[PDB]
Amino acid sequence: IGKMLNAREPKVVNGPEILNKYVGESEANIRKLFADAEEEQRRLGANSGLHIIIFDEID
Amino acid sequence: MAEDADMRNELEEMQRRADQLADESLESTRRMLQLVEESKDAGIRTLVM
């Protein structure tokens, strides 16, 4: 579907792949996904192409 | 887990400061701003006279 409707690219992640023993490192690896979208959205308003995310397993 | 680790770590200082004097090189390049202008300032007006 990313190919169907063009996003920039998919960045795919697995849930268990981002978990850190240290307190503050387990939330930031998430936010680094959305920053790439936040930039384009604020910059180019509301006609920007999708920044798409996929989680391999969230559960 | 039920784990809290809050930690610290230490620095490795960069090189290029054998002695502070090295910045005196800037005091040199001040001086070759100081010792350059009067050469031409008297050169062209020495041509005037």
Side-chain angles (χ1 to χ4, degrees), chain A residues 9-25:
Chain A
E9 294 294 328
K11 64 178 72 65
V12 65
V13 299
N14 192 2
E17 194 266 351
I18 59 169
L19 282 73
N20 295 114
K21 293 181 263 72
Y22 294 159
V23 298
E25 295 294 329

Side-chain angles (χ1 to χ4, degrees), chain B residues 11-46:
Chain B
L11 276 295
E12 295 296 330
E13 182 66 26
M14 295 296 172
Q15 226 197 357
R16 101 193 167 181
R17 177 255 182 199
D19 271 328
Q20 174 187 15
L21 62 85
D23 191 359
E24 294 179 353
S25 298
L26 184 62
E27 295 178 353
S28 178
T29 61
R30 294 282 76 79
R31 290 190 295 272
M32 68 86 205
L33 293 175
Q34 294 179 357
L35 282 72
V36 297
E37 70 276 17
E38 69 276 16
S39 296
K40 295 184 266 73
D41 291 331
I44 296 88
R45 278 82 67 192
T46 300

